[PDB]
Amino acid sequence: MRYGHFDDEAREYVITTPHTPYPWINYLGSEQFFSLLSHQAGGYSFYRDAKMRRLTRYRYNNIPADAGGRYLYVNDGGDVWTPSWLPVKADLDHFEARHGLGYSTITGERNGVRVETLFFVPVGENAEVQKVTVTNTSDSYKSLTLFSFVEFCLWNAQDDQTNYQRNLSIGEVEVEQESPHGSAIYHRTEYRERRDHYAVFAVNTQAEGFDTDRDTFVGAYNSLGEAAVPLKGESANSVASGWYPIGSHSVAVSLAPGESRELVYVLGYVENPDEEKWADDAKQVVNKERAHALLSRFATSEQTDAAFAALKDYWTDLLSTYSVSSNDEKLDRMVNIWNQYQCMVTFNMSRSASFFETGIGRGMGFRDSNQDLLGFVHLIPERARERIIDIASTQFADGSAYHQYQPLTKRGNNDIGSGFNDDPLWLIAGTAAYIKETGDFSILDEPVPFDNEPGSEVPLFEHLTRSFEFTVTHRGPHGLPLIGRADWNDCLNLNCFSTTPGESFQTIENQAGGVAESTFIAAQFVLYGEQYAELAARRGLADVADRARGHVAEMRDALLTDGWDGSWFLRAYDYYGNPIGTDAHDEGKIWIEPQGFAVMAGVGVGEGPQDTDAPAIKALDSVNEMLATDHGMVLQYPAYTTYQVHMGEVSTYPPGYKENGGIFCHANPWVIIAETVVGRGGRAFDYYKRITPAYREDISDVHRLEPYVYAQMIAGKEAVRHGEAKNSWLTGTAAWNFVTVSQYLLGVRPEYDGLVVDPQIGPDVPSFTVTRVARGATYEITVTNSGTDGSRGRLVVDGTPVEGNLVPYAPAGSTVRVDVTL
Amino acid sequence: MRYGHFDDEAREYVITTPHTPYPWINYLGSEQFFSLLSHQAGGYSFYRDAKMRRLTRYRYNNIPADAGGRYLYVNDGGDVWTPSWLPVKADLDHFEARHGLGYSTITGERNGVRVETLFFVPVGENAEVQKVTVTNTSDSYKSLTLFSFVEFCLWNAQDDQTNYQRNLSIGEVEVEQESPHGSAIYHRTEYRERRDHYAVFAVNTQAEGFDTDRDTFVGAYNSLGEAAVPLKGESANSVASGWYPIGSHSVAVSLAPGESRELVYVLGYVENPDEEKWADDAKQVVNKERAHALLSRFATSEQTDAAFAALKDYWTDLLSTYSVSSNDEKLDRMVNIWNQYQCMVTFNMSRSASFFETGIGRGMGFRDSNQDLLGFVHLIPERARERIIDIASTQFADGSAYHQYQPLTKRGNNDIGSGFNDDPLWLIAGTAAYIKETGDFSILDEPVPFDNEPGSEVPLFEHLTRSFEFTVTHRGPHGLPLIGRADWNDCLNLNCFSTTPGESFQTIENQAGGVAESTFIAAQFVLYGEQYAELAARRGLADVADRARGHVAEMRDALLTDGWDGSWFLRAYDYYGNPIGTDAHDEGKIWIEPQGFAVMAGVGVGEGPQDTDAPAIKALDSVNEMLATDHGMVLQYPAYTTYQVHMGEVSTYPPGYKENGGIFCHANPWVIIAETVVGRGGRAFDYYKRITPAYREDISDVHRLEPYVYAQMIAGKEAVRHGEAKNSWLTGTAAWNFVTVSQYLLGVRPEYDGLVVDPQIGPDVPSFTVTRVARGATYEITVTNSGTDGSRGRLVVDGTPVEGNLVPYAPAGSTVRVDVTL
After folding, report:
1. Would the CB atoms of A658 and B169 count as touching at under 8 Å?
2. For residue A810, what is the DSSP state?
3. Keywords assigned by UniProt (chains A, B) (predicted)?
4. Taking the C-alpha atoms of A367, A370, A375 and A376 in order, what is their torsion angle to the nearest 10 degrees?
5. How many other C-beta atoms are found inside a 10 Å radius of the C-beta of residue B540?
């Protein structure tokens, strides 16, 4: 069944009931200020870093889930309810939530009163704005009191929920009932000491009353659904001192029948230079200038409506670089709106904060963030270029890298492990995708520190050299790269041997030495090793390019000789040089990661799909018999049913879950792309449709999570919950699936010299058009597609048959028309 | 007002309403298994380490507070309620909670049904047992279904609530409806991998049904008060796979009028040797032998009643070493029951887990744990002796110490900072108190590693030498000890200079060098420097003792010359050698810590209370004019009203809270003891009564927290919440207040050569008797007390006047009668 439906004209997902299988969230903001907002107004907001600057408090694993957030309590002659349904859970006559691009609306109506709240983060603002429209839909007059509500976090989210022994005594606010445009409350915890920032929570009318103390507003022994102040019908005017600061105004509203009233609430992040912090000599009063400035920018409905319209315009421009028109409207929906939109979210937030990721331990992953670029280069290239510099700056001089870094400070840390040997090659992966998209080679010349260290700056191209050489100088006995702590698969820990609990595998000390090798990193070196060689060559460094091609050539032979099991690729060699991922074993015979990535690098590829004997065809066929399920390909098979002490975290998950037999969706695109490489478009599209949101919308009761974005993992076939997703929104899946569908199934992809047009999608999409803006020119590409295996497109360029599948770049301002037959 | 009352005959605090100002908790267990239990059955259980082996889940900062726990849902013909009131919050005809020693009972009755639950951790058991008595108090028959409930934590409490991205997929159980004595559920998360332990949750009858999945039992969009299974009236028989494992049995009960039924529930921690983990070859099934064993030990009411009775006997024996009889029944209550009981809790749990301490970041503090001993040596000396070895083993070889260590592993860590220069001298403090209590000098000869390192073992006496010398070799320009990161006052950070947020002061890198000195550590070196010298002397090391006495003598002169402000002692010298705690400044003129501790070391003490000119008398008088409040003495005065960037965390608290003007209760005893040293017993008792639980019981609406135990901090007079406590139960206050009241106000204290009897308590306790068992002999001490300043007791020993205030130790088995006049 389903719990909503897409509105494509409006670019929304419409949720038509509060009763979803799980809270379904949207992200607001796309720059430096971000809100997680569920279809029940639950979630929170943070500036730049969800661990370090979290404005509002959110409880994960709450009972019930998502039972805190941005609430508006409506008092109608004693009867109190919330338009978001939760927390009060009063019966409503109408409920609807629309999740849009950077905005959502939530409408709830009861006993002839309707509240619509629009939530968004305005372009160029560090604030979350709410436009509330209250409508009398009844026959007679209405006298209402509205109580806004939000609960502050004390900035440090980790301190906020572990350190009450100090926390309970630092909560400080300032109250401003007569603000120049209404009323505002200031959350200024720790402003007295080191923080130069505070939050403001304001309404654009004179509020009747306020509250800043949670225990007063909610009342003893009470849930947010039983909150006392809204029930008494008048604010308490509480002034927090320690305990739990909140933001809350009451507003009196009288409405004739059919009359509506509009209110604008604002939650802002404000920052004063240290010299400019105090209004007063005594340093007791926050300087409020910048906050008033913000509040004057949203003092009226007109201003709010214009900011909303600017945000539409912003997304319209962003979505204008790639789109498609076909018979398949789910396909179209994903390519044109939701996947590109999700890619923007993953670029900004990485893997740190969702309704699964707690925005505590994880910042920006070195490998996750490089991979996110592949899906974001087309959207905003300038910000993509800057991010590459920031990531490369967390690389060490020996070519090894900080596994992740902190969003606020941009500085690397070892909080979730160090010494993952697959990390360095990803840097090449993102830089090359950026230069193909833009033609901007000048980034190779940007100076970049090692470990953020001044005076260590060398050109970014030299960072890429260190990345290539790191692998070159860390190969094992078979010539395959030494694995280290792990590769892309974080739970493949062959240098660990921990039999005692209490410490994560990701951070636990590793035993030095051994010969543990990785076929995945091997594939990775072949793929990104070439890209690095081609950059060196274009740079004019011919000896360098040739040496590297030599090393790539060698790793290719090593992969086929010592990394090949007979019917598929091996996965690794353990610390003592024993194979992993062989038919010789009873469990974990076949792993997806090497199969997809090796065939993507061209390894084992023969002449046709017809040439079944080619290693790539076998590995892929083995993958279809052993790994593929209705809901996607599982990670390896069979799952391990007992702890493999020499292998780390992988076998610690119950079978069918996560790294042990789960469907990691991120790995799927790799196989799908491989299928297009070997010419089986129909198979490749099928893999695509099984894990793609628009196609799984009709089994929303199985998937459970959002029908409009990719998830990290789906319960695999050895799991009793097979089909159910976890960890939605924040996943490499998004970027990699965009790369897959846009560049290999539809087949329009940037190269340094031209646009390649080489579709491979099968009989299910007989005709389509791609509109692609590249290098300042627009390419209109019409494809007539027979779907046949092994059949690749023949180009006509501006009415004239041409050879090959590459169209060289036209001057900006040009319009090129490409017609493809296959 | 009050919310309960003491029952002294039963040794209980009786809470007569659910509606307390804050959840009021008790601790169950006194060995290796521990439960936090509130008067609403909220809380959780853990084995040895509250961070690492937490069986059950608990939410801090919940809305409402304490809304999860060990519940029993009563279904009476469709009407569902809980005897603990929360979570359902149904009206009850009767409610009562009794908090006892290692046990509590909770009774709730509604519509002619009464449930009494007794909660305890049995002596010698790693389990929490519940004896439930259900009574039909109505006129007709009752058919009830009872639903037990508890929610598991996944052992690692920190992982459990930050790491859902992995957590949601590892939850595993086993269900055993036909257990040999009833029915049991097994929580076995991560047993598949590195854990050799699992939890069992069982009932001693055949349960009608079970649930192990929280979302099924509670139902979507529901709180625990709206839980669905109890309302439908039959279990769902859910088998968790990932998500949120719980434990739950339904039991059918039919009762004639006035009939009662008894049920025994058990929550156990079980551990199998690695060889003995599986029942089966396949390793899919936990070996259940040890769990069945446990369950057969509580299969009947009779067995449960005997374990309860053994626990009474255990506390009776423990409380038999020190007691008193006087006119003051609040005084008596504290000395005889609650303070000694609290001292046992602090010895076991330290500062790690309460309703304020999250049982995440803190293990066993090196200084907290040494100080806890002073209050626990008299109770169980054998376990005290062992703890001293464990603490000393976390000391480094240069004499410096790990600031805290992990309870499970006993290993030191720097999680909450390193390099606190007051830490090493505390080790002397606890060892000396142990040897005075026991006469066991042989502990000085026990071999002890530095940093838990095998082969580094030296005799404990040598650890004490390193402690003394560390101070000797780290003194500043005035001869006072260099402060380091901080002293006993953790927020006095003079080597910090951090103006950027995001990192705690306690762990943040300190700037090397400077001359920051501490007068507190100075006092500390004088007090514990003598104790170390006297041990060296008794050891026969005469050169060593004399050298040390020389150094103590010097530090005494340094404290009076360069640590004296004129009317009180200075607090410190900052990094550049500028004073802190001087009348020359507008804020923080006077700090409590040096005043109490210096006068306790004898520094500045003259001939009489009459000699007002003596520095000790001045400092104490300054302390009464400037620091003392109705609720206790604040830490310093005036509070700082702006960030002092050169001073660390202290000024980051709002005035009147914690280290910035709060009443730290732990520091109070030091002044109180000092008052007895200078002979002002009436003043000393007054300070005592202001912060002591039995005396503050009549302002329970002000104190808010438990009326039966000490808290860490009370809002100081510059706080708008002046009088309100935070951080109850876990505080050095307990140990230090026991030392104060038992050894200096009542004046009976152990010395190596005899019992000293030297009461100093004032006119409010004109007569009393102390019964003190020391060295195997019983001393009966009757005191006739005029209360007069400067008047010290004259002893009569077994009917015969003697000189001095020391009674030498009699052979075990002896009874000595001491009569004191003053």
Report:
1. yes
2. P
3. Glycosyltransferase, Transferase
4. 140
5. 8
> A355 near A25, Cβ under 8 Å?
yes
Residue of A nearest to B647 (CA): A193
HEC string of B499-530? CCCCCCCCCCCCCCCCCCEEHHHHHHHHHHHH
Tell me the one-letter amino acid at B292.
H
CA separation for the pair A735, A748 (Å, rounded): 15
Put the strands of the sheet holding A572-573 in their side by side order: A517-518, A572-573, A579-580
Give CA–CA dist B175/B211, Å, rounded. 9
Phi and psi at B218, nearest 5°, equal -85, -35
B592 touches B520 (CB < 8 A): no
Give the separation between CA B762 and CA B785, rounded to whole angstroms: 8
Token pair 């019409």: residue: A782
Confirm if B304 and B298 have CB atoms less than 8 A apart: yes
Which residues of chain A lie closer than 8 angstroms to B89, CB-CB? 221
Per CB-CB distance under 8 Å, the chain B contacts of A273 are none
Catalytic residue among A490, A574, A758, A819: A490
End-to-end CA distance of chain B: 37
Beta-bridge partner residues of B105: B98, B118
Distance, CA of A500 to CA of A643 (rounded, Å):
12
Structure-token pair, residue B801: 């006047």
Transcribe B398-419 into DSSP letters.
Answer: TS-B-SEEETTTTEEE-TT-S-
Which residues, at least 6 apart from A83, have a Cβ–Cβ distance to it below 8 Å? A72, A74, A92, A106, A107, A108, A109, A115, A116, A117
Q: At what angle do helices B423-438 and B460-472 cross, to 10 degrees?
A: 140
Q: For B803, phi and psi rounded to 5 degrees?
A: -90, 150
Of B403, B544, B384, B522, which Cα lies nearest the Cα of B462?
B544
Contact B591, B579 (CB under 8 A): no
Cβ of B161 within 8 Å of Cβ of A61? The answer is yes
Contact A193 B652 (CB under 8 A): yes
Enumerate residues 6+ apart whose C-beta is below 8 A from B295: B179, B180, B181, B182, B184, B200, B202, B204, B266, B268
Strand pairing category for A636-637 and A632-633? unpaired
Are A692 and A334 contacting, i.e. CB atoms less than 8 angstroms apart?
yes
Residue with tokens 């921690």: B269
Residue B220 Cα, gap to closest chain A Cα (Å): 7
Which residue matches tokens 């690729």? A569
For an interface test with B, give the residue of A165, A505, A507, A727 to mutate (most B CBs within 10 A).
A165
Q: Do A60 and B504 touch (CB under 8 A)?
A: no
Give the CA distances from residue A501 to residues A342, A509, B416, B563, in Å, rounded to whole numbers and listed in that order.
Answer: 36, 13, 22, 50
Using a 10 angstrom Cβ sphere, with 0-12 exposed, 13-18 middle and 19 or more buried, the burial of residue B287 is middle
Max Cα distance, chain B (Å)? 85
- Residue whose tokens read 């053994």: B310
Cα separation, B615 vs B558, whole angstroms: 14
Whether residue A490 lies in the annotated active site? yes
Q: B502 vs A283: CB contact, 8 Å cut-off? A: no
Nearest-CA neighbor of B368 among B739, B664, B730?
A: B730
**Half-sphere exposure in the Cβ direction for B216 (13 Å, CA):** 19
CA distance A278 to chain B (A): 11
Q: Domains along chain B? A: 1-271+700-710 (2.70.98.40), 272-321 (1.20.890.20), 322-328+746-822 (2.60.420.10), 329-680+711-745 (1.50.10.10)
- Which of A521, A343, A531, A547 lies closest to A444, judged by CA? A531
**Angstrom distance (rounded) from CA A732 to CA A342:** 10
